[PDB]
Amino acid sequence: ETWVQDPLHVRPIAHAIWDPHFGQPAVEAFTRGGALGPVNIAYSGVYQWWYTIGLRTNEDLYTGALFLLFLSA
Amino acid sequence: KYGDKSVYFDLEDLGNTTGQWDVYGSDAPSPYNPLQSKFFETFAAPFTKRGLLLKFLILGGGSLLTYVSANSTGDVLPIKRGPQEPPKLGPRGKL
Amino acid sequence: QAALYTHHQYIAGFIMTGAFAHGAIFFIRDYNPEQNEDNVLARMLDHKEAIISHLSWASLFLGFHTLGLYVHND
Amino acid sequence: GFTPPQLDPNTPSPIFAGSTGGLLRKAQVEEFYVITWNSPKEQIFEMPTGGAAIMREGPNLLKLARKEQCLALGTRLRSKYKITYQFYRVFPNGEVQYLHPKDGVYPEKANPGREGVGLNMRSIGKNVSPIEVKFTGKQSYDL
Amino acid sequence: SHSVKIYDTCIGCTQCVRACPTDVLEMIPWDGCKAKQIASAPRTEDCVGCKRCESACPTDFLSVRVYLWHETTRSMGLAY
Amino acid sequence: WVTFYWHWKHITLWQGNVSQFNESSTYLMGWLRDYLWLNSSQLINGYNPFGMNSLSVWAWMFLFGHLVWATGFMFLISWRGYWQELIETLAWAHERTPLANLIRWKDKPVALSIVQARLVGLAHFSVGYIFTYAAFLIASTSGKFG
Amino acid sequence: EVKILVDRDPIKTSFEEWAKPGHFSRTIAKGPDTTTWIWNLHADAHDFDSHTSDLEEISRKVFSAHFGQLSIIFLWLSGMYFHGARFSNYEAWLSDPTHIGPSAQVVWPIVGQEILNGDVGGGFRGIQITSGFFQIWRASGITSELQLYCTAIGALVFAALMLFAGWFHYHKAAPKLAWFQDVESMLNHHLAGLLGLGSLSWAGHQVHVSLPINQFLNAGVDPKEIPLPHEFILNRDLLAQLYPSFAEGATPFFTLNWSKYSEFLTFRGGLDPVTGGLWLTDIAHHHLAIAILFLIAGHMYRTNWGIGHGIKDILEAHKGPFTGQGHKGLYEILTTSWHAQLSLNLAMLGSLTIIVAHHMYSMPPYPYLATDYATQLSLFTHHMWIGGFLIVGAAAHAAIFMVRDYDPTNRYNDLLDRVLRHRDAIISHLNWVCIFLGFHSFGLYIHNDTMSALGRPQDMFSDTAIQLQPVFAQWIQNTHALAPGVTAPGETASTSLTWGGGELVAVGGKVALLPIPLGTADFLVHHIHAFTIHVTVLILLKGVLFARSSRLIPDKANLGFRFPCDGPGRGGTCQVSAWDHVFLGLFWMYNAISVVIFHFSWKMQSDVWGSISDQGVVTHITGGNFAQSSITINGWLRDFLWAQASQVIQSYGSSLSAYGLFFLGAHFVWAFSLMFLFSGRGYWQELIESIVWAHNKLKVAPATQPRALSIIQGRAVGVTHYLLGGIATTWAFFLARIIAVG
Amino acid sequence: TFNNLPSIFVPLVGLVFPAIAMASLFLHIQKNK
Numbered sequence A: 001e002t003w004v005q006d007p008l009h010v011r012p013i014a015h016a017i018w019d020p021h022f023g024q025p026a027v028e029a030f031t032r033g034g035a036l037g038p039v040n041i042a043y044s045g046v047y048q049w050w051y052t053i054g055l056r057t058n059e060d061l062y063t064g065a066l067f068l069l070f071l072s073a
Numbered sequence B: 001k002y003g004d005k006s007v008y009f010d011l012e013d014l015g016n017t018t019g020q021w022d023v024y025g026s027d028a029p030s031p032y033n034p035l036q037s038k039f040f041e042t043f044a045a046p047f048t049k050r051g052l053l054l055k056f057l058i059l060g061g062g063s064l065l066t067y068v069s070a071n072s073t074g075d076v077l078p079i080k081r082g083p084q085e086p087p088k089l090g091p092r093g094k095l
Numbered sequence C: 001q002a003a004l005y006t007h008h009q010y011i012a013g014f015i016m017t018g019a020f021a022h023g024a025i026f027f028i029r030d031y032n033p034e035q036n037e038d039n040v041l042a043r044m045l046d047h048k049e050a051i052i053s054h055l056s057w058a059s060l061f062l063g064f065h066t067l068g069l070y071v072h073n074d
Numbered sequence D: 001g002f003t004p005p006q007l008d009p010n011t012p013s014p015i016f017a018g019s020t021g022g023l024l025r026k027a028q029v030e031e032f033y034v035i036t037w038n039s040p041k042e043q044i045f046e047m048p049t050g051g052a053a054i055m056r057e058g059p060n061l062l063k064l065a066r067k068e069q070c071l072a073l074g075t076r077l078r079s080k081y082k083i084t085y086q087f088y089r090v091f092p093n094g095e096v097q098y099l100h101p102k103d104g105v106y107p108e109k110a111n112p113g114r115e116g117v118g119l120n121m122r123s124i125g126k127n128v129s130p131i132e133v134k135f136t137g138k139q140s141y142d143l
Numbered sequence E: 001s002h003s004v005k006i007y008d009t010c011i012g013c014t015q016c017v018r019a020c021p022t023d024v025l026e027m028i029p030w031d032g033c034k035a036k037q038i039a040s041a042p043r044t045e046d047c048v049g050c051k052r053c054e055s056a057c058p059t060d061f062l063s064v065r066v067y068l069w070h071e072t073t074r075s076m077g078l079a080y
Numbered sequence F: 001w002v003t004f005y006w007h008w009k010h011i012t013l014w015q016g017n018v019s020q021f022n023e024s025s026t027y028l029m030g031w032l033r034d035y036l037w038l039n040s041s042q043l044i045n046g047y048n049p050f051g052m053n054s055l056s057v058w059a060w061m062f063l064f065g066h067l068v069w070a071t072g073f074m075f076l077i078s079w080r081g082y083w084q085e086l087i088e089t090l091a092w093a094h095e096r097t098p099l100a101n102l103i104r105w106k107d108k109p110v111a112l113s114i115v116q117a118r119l120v121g122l123a124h125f126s127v128g129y130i131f132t133y134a135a136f137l138i139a140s141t142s143g144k145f146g
Numbered sequence G: 001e002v003k004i005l006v007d008r009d010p011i012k013t014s015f016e017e018w019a020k021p022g023h024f025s026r027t028i029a030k031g032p033d034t035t036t037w038i039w040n041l042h043a044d045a046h047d048f049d050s051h052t053s054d055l056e057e058i059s060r061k062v063f064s065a066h067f068g069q070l071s072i073i074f075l076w077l078s079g080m081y082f083h084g085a086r087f088s089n090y091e092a093w094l095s096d097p098t099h100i101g102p103s104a105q106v107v108w109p110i111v112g113q114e115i116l117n118g119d120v121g122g123g124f125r126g127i128q129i130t131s132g133f134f135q136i137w138r139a140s141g142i143t144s145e146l147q148l149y150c151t152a153i154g155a156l157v158f159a160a161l162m163l164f165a166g167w168f169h170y171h172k173a174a175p176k177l178a179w180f181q182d183v184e185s186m187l188n189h190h191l192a193g194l195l196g197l198g199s200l201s202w203a204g205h206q207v208h209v210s211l212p213i214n215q216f217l218n219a220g221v222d223p224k225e226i227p228l229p230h231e232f233i234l235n236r237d238l239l240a241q242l243y244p245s246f247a248e249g250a251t252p253f254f255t256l257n258w259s260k261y262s263e264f265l266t267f268r269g270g271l272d273p274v275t276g277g278l279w280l281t282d283i284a285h286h287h288l289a290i291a292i293l294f295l296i297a298g299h300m301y302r303t304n305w306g307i308g309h310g311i312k313d314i315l316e317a318h319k320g321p322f323t324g325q326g327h328k329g330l331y332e333i334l335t336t337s338w339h340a341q342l343s344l345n346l347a348m349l350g351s352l353t354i355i356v357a358h359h360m361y362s363m364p365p366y367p368y369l370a371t372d373y374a375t376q377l378s379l380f381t382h383h384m385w386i387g388g389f390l391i392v393g394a395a396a397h398a399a400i401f402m403v404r405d406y407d408p409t410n411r412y413n414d415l416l417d418r419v420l421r422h423r424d425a426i427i428s429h430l431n432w433v434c435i436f437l438g439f440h441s442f443g444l445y446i447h448n449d450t451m452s453a454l455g456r457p458q459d460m461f462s463d464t465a466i467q468l469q470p471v472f473a474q475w476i477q478n479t480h481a482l483a484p485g486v487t488a489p490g491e492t493a494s495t496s497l498t499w500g501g502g503e504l505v506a507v508g509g510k511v512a513l514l515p516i517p518l519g520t521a522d523f524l525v526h527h528i529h530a531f532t533i534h535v536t537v538l539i540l541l542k543g544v545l546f547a548r549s550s551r552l553i554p555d556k557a558n559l560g561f562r563f564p565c566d567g568p569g570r571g572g573t574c575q576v577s578a579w580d581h582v583f584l585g586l587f588w589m590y591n592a593i594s595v596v597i598f599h600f601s602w603k604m605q606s607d608v609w610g611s612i613s614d615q616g617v618v619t620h621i622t623g624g625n626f627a628q629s630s631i632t633i634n635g636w637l638r639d640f641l642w643a644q645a646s647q648v649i650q651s652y653g654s655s656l657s658a659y660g661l662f663f664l665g666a667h668f669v670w671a672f673s674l675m676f677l678f679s680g681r682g683y684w685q686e687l688i689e690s691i692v693w694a695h696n697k698l699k700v701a702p703a704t705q706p707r708a709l710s711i712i713q714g715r716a717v718g719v720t721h722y723l724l725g726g727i728a729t730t731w732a733f734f735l736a737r738i739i740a741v742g
Numbered sequence H: 001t002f003n004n005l006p007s008i009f010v011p012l013v014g015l016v017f018p019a020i021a022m023a024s025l026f027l028h029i030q031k032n033k
């Protein structure tokens, strides 16, 4: 939802990270994209391709994920 | 006969031939005290069914692991403490 | 834009190696030389030495020359 | 029904100070391939388990690890020392299967009394392709 | 275990079996050659797959032929 | 080769200095210096003896891929027989080591089959190729974003 | 007992066998049905144990082959001394050796390669050599180029003499087997007569020629002003003006009044602070004492007279309680087998080359060696590599003994049998300790790498986080620094200044071997070295022991020493041969010596070498980044490999450009080797048969049938290209790095 | 709780699911009928 507004200057986020081996410097360094915790930057472009086909909210992605789970079942 | 002069193929006693030996397996009786032995027997007979032991081990260990990692705060693991630091703006603005 | 290109090209290289490997597995397991005698596929296996030799030529030519040029420039 | 097995008795074993290439737990649950030979003199030979052994004048007996060990030993015996040998297979239950000549004659002299198996009466190119035997237990070479 | 096969191109030179270190092979009489003998493979259970037999078969391609197949403890050549 | 060409042409375009590629891509020491040695500057410094940054994961993955890419050379260069003999010694030791004689395997241990170990060497080799170049590409294009 | 048993005209000098290639072998002396024949013509060329069965002809062949090798080395030294004489700046390097690059090779201006002739210094354009011949020549008191040309001519003469000697001792009058087997006289002579008298004669040179000349060269004298060496022999007043003990001559010697010889035979251990090398005064006394020692040691073995130890009487005397008969039989398996002796001498000569590498950096014996960081690094690295190779060849030839020359019937040994009988125990414990060391030496690097990547530098194994200090090595270091005193009086200083209590030998702007501090990184890398050595010994010892038999192949000796396999059976039995074990041990020796010379280069450039200004502040080449960055692999990749490879790759258009060229080329040859190590023969034979169809289509079918390389040959080509490529990569990288920043 | 769910699922997955999976698969390997 933040990437949609300023995409050129807001970093994508693949998923958060909970690695209990992390030290506090690593918790501090991996906090990107305006997150309250560590994160990994989506170098997959899924942000761009979802934003180009609609999908301008997190609820849109939630509905899509639930529907794809239904499709997997 | 296995004990003859350089005979090691007693076909009847195939254990001595193939090397089936308790090399250190002393058959000496229980050196423990009887009372503490009975104590351990009665207090560890719950762990006699290997299948129930395995189910208990896996489920209780996973439960304790989730409990530790969910109730532990950031003082014992920095990943739950969080950033406690402002985020650096990446290259080229942030992209 | 780099991760996607690199991704799909390594994927394409693997998929291509697998395409050929499954053609080989076909030529062993599923190829009946009597049911396709003297056909495009059978006439193909005939001049396998010609194909292999001319592909060898192309690779040998390219590697020789282009490595020579890179080395000349080095 | 022309050559009976020999049923190795409690013969002496070669003089050997013991090695680590000997009989492991394979003998304790599977076969271990005893070999028997008959020496003219007390001579010294290389053991297939590594190390040097001193064979005894007269019959000997060695329980080494497996078939290739005793057959390599017996080939070295027959070639270097010119000595008749025969080896066995001793399952842990107790049975003793006779194996090396299985006819009293080594398996080079084509002596009649042995049935030919593993015998495809064709040249090696005339085997069918796998597609002709697809979805069948016979792979390529048992028709 | 392994499937050793002897084809009818064999000249009966007795190298396949004099090279075989596990008594898999044995020469038998035959009427297809000047030597009047051919190799057979009864004891394929003792076959390790070392292909010393077919590294000594002097024919166009081969007459003896070893096919790698279900590997057991004795075809894998294990003392343990 | 394809992706090295791509990444260098594009990182030079994005940085602005197409002349770097157009002058240095014609001789291999340009690729070894101006592409690999130069763009790996911000990566291997992902975690120095004094602190780390966001590219620590990419440096660790870089070295991880180097490691498996080297481990594949084990299964490729070394083949089956040295390892079977080594495992025979190991089996002797385990069956004659006290307090571990009580423990006996159920599957008789053997060195990996030749075709298997080939496959395993290629798996390590390709995993290392891929993870190494992913680390390098991602870290170089993310350390700067041109 | 001992004699000169030698037979005349055994072999005819004729080109008739040159015309018939492969004459030495039976299968090779009938024609090339295939191309593999030529590979077998070179492979078996020096396999004299396979050509013949009698040891007499083999001994003659190898004796004359050693003469050819000595001819080659005399010709090589001829080249070095000559190139120093004519194509060098040695006459100028003596003036300012701390700033002029030693150069002895010039290239021809043809294709732009004249850039290699660079500004070494001395008004001379050439290649900055890293051999240390200039340092020797300053230690030999040359002070000219005429002496070098005369030395080259004399070396060419001795090369021709050795060539004639090989011809004479094979074709004209060849010794028979009773002559070589008299090892008692051979040791008595090579100890006393080669090593004793050789060190004595070099002590004579060191006393008469090197010492008086270096007394002037170090005392600001120009080489043109120095008196010639023979003027010290002819005129003793000039020699006595610096060392008055020569005025008394040998009367101090023969009267045992040696106390009045200390002007030139010293014990003041340490480095000459005017040039950084050891005191030549100490080296003269050294080689003298070594002469005495080898001279009394070469009168140990009975040769013809009633005195002396018969080596059989020494070996048979040692018979262990539960070790059996003991060393009985060894005199008969060492004197009736060249391969056993070759293995023993190779192992010791290789470890000795390594000890040379280790003692030539920490006790620089030549002037201006420690300050020529290129020479120091290159010499250490060289001799380390030679030692690893010689040890690996010792393994190969132990295996060849065990396959061919080992006979428990006739030439029996007890201890070798006992080793063969628990070989599984040896290899099991070695295979364990290799894994233990691997873990607790390299997994520590992995732990440090992960902890530094997780932002946990307080959890590494560093000199700051978790102490793994070399307490034992630190104790030896501190007690060797405080060794001058109660334990070793009359030395005036430590025998080396690589210990913490030592001092800095400032030579010019350079530093020249101040103390070496041992920290956690040294612990980690030394256990890495123990690890790599132990794995190499695992592989090689395993090949040697299982050369004859295993549980897998019990008839491996009948298959030979050098065979690929025994088929895909038994799950696959590739590389069961001892040849393949040593082929793998080559790679592991490579990894070992590579990390060794990396440790050397980095520890030196960070903690030893550098530049010390006149104020006393020493700045090292890297900046002391070893103990902090050599705890994790990313430091070796970043601060050693990536950083120090900024002078070999940036050297394009410079004088050091062949170094970057061979950097890339050795990279290539290594990778090319991977085509051989990874692939197999069958693919290449099928491809060759396809392109042979393409040739037969054009009537270009060669009669020497194109065959893909044999399997063992593919492995040989792979390991040699792999080693050559990795080693030339490292050579170029080191030399450019260390010549550029110097 | 959403910030506490990785702390429950990552130790769950990456340690227990190996326990369950590798144990059950070793039992499936070492089986006889």
Ligand code: CLA
Binding pocket: C055, C056, C057, C059, C060, C061, C062, C063, C064, C067, G668, G671, G672, G673, G674, G675, G676, G678, G679, G683, G687
């Ligand atoms: C840097 C490493 C490297 C190099 C140089 C090669 C080179 C080659 N491979 Mg590949 N290969 C490699 C790694 C490499 N491979 C690896 C790691 C594997 C995995 C096992 C393979 C697997 C493989 C297969 C499976 C096949 C090849 C093929 C080929 C040939 C392709 C034809 C070509 O371009 O040749 C042009 C020539 C060269 C590249 C050689 C370069 C050297 C120069 C030109 C020689 C001259 C220099 C000098 C004057 C000689 C003297 C040197 C010294 C004695 C003084 C060629 C020889 C194919 C083939 O044979 O097709 C014909 C083929 O089928 N290779």
Ligand code: CLA
Binding pocket: G011, G012, G013, G014, G015, G016, G017, G018, G019, G023, G024, G060, G061, G062, G064, G065, G067, G068, G069, G163, G164, G165, G166, G167, G170, G171
């Ligand atoms: C020049 C005169 C001469 C002549 C005509 C012969 C003739 C002969 N010699 Mg004798 N020999 C000579 C000199 C000579 N020798 C010398 C000087 C030595 C001492 C090294 C020997 C030592 C010697 C031994 C030990 C043996 C012979 C043998 C032979 C016979 C076969 C040699 C053959 O075909 O290989 C021809 C080989 C070559 C032409 C090349 C050999 C390599 C040379 C010596 C050195 C190479 C240096 C080179 C620079 C290094 C490579 C690096 C390069 C890549 C840069 C033949 C009767 C053999 C024999 O009779 O046994 C049956 C035998 O065993 N010779």
Ligand code: CLA
Binding pocket: G131, G132, G133, G135, G136, G194, G195, G349, G352, G353, G356, G366, G379, G382, G383, G386
């Ligand atoms: C590939 C083989 C090879 C090559 C090319 C070189 C090349 C070089 N060596 Mg090395 N070396 C080698 C093998 C090799 N070495 C081995 C195997 C040994 C172990 C004996 C040595 C021991 C050695 C020493 C000790 C020194 C060199 C030096 C040198 C350099 C000057 C050459 C010279 O002759 O100066 C003249 C040679 C000397 C001054 C050496 C003195 C003689 C030694 C101490 C002993 C005598 C040998 C003995 C008779 C045989 C061994 C006896 C046995 C009991 C072990 C040059 C870089 C010298 C150097 O780096 O100078 C800067 C130097 O000091 N090397």
Ligand code: CLA
Binding pocket: G042, G043, G044, G045, G046, G047, G048, G342, G346, G389, G390, G391, G392, G393, G394, G396, G397, G400, G561, G562, G579, G582, G583, G586, G720, G724
């Ligand atoms: C004192 C030293 C010494 C001596 C006398 C010998 C002598 C011998 N060795 Mg041993 N060996 C040595 C050192 C030594 N080796 C070392 C240091 C190693 C470690 C690698 C080995 C490893 C080794 C193995 C593994 C084998 C031998 C074998 C042999 C025998 C035959 C070799 C032959 O005919 O090849 C003649 C010469 C050649 C074929 C040329 C080799 C080509 C080299 C690799 C070229 C590349 C190296 C070069 C420096 C790089 C420059 C490249 C440039 C040209 C472009 C012979 C008895 C063989 C044997 O006994 O077989 C039964 C055998 O299998 N050796």
Ligand code: CLA
Binding pocket: F067, F070, F071, F072, F073, F074, F077, F078, F082, G430, G431, G432, G434, G435, G436, G437, G438, G439, G442, G443, G444, G446, G535, G538, G539, G584, G585, G587, G588
């Ligand atoms: C980097 C590449 C690499 C690595 C890691 C290894 C690893 C090993 N080699 Mg191999 N080898 C390689 C390349 C490599 N080799 C190549 C290229 C060759 C070609 C010649 C060989 C040839 C070769 C031979 C011929 C021999 C070895 C031996 C060894 C062993 C010694 C170290 C050991 O066990 O200690 C512990 C393990 C290591 C140091 C490896 C790194 C592992 C780290 C420290 C920890 C791993 C993580 C941990 C277990 C957590 C697991 C997590 C879970 C998710 C899985 C080990 C299996 C020797 C052997 O088997 O006997 C000991 C032996 O004889 N190797």
Ligand code: CLA
Binding pocket: A015, A016, A017, A018, A019, A020, A021, A026, A040, F056, F057, F060, G450, G453, G454, G455, H010, H013, H014, H015, H017, H018, H021, H022
């Ligand atoms: C000791 C080293 C170590 C270890 C153990 C971990 C562990 C972990 N890290 Mg990592 N990490 C490390 C060092 C380490 N980290 C370092 C040094 C860095 C750089 C600073 C990072 C950076 C990092 C990031 C950026 C992220 C992690 C994440 C994770 C978690 C992944 C979740 C999981 O269960 O994966 C499960 C395992 C896999 C997915 C591996 C799949 C491949 C396997 C091997 C094949 C499976 C075989 C078969 C198909 C299935 C059969 C069953 C099988 C169990 C046998 C996990 C807790 C992620 C996280 O927190 O999300 C939850 C994440 O985003 N880490």
Ligand SMILES: CC1=C(/C=C/C(C)=C/C=C/C(C)=C/C=C/C=C(C)/C=C/C=C(C)/C=C/C2=C(C)CCCC2(C)C)C(C)(C)CCC1
Binding pocket: C016, C019, C020, C021, C022, C023, C024, C026, C027
């Ligand atoms: C210019 C252009 C054009 C045209 C083009 C073209 C015409 C192209 C072509 C192209 C091509 C032409 C391509 C190709 C490709 C191929 C491939 C990629 C192949 C592969 C193969 C394989 C993989 C194989 C497999 C197998 C085998 C091995 C055998 C058996 C069988 C099989 C088949 C299975 C147009 C105008 C339109 C448009 C624009 C552009």
Ligand SMILES: CC1=C(C/C=C(\C)CCC[C@H](C)CCC[C@H](C)CCCC(C)C)C(=O)c2ccccc2C1=O
Binding pocket: G675, G676, G677, G678, G679, G680, G681, G682, G684, G685, G707, G708, G709, G710, G711, G713, G714, G715
């Ligand atoms: C490439 C390769 C081959 C084939 C290598 C060939 C046979 C070498 C190529 C031919 C050489 C270069 C000889 C041709 C040069 C001749 C001297 C002819 C001269 C012609 C002019 C150049 C003068 C193998 O046989 C092999 C075997 C086992 C494992 C890996 C491999 C392997 O990787």
Ligand code: SF4
Binding pocket: E006, E009, E010, E011, E012, E013, E014, E015, E016, E017, E038, E039, E053, E056, E057, E058, E059, E063, E064
């Ligand atoms: S080796 Fe071949 S040709 Fe000779 S006997 Fe055996 S099967 Fe017949």
Ligand code: SF4
Binding pocket: E004, E016, E019, E020, E021, E022, E023, E024, E025, E046, E047, E048, E049, E050, E051, E052, E053, E054, E066, G569
């Ligand atoms: S593969 Fe080996 S064991 Fe089998 S038949 Fe051939 S030689 Fe005998």
Ligand code: SF4
Binding pocket: F079, F114, G564, G565, G566, G567, G568, G569, G572, G573, G574, G575, G680, G711
């Ligand atoms: S792969 Fe090569 S080395 Fe291994 S068994 Fe087969 S032929 Fe022998």
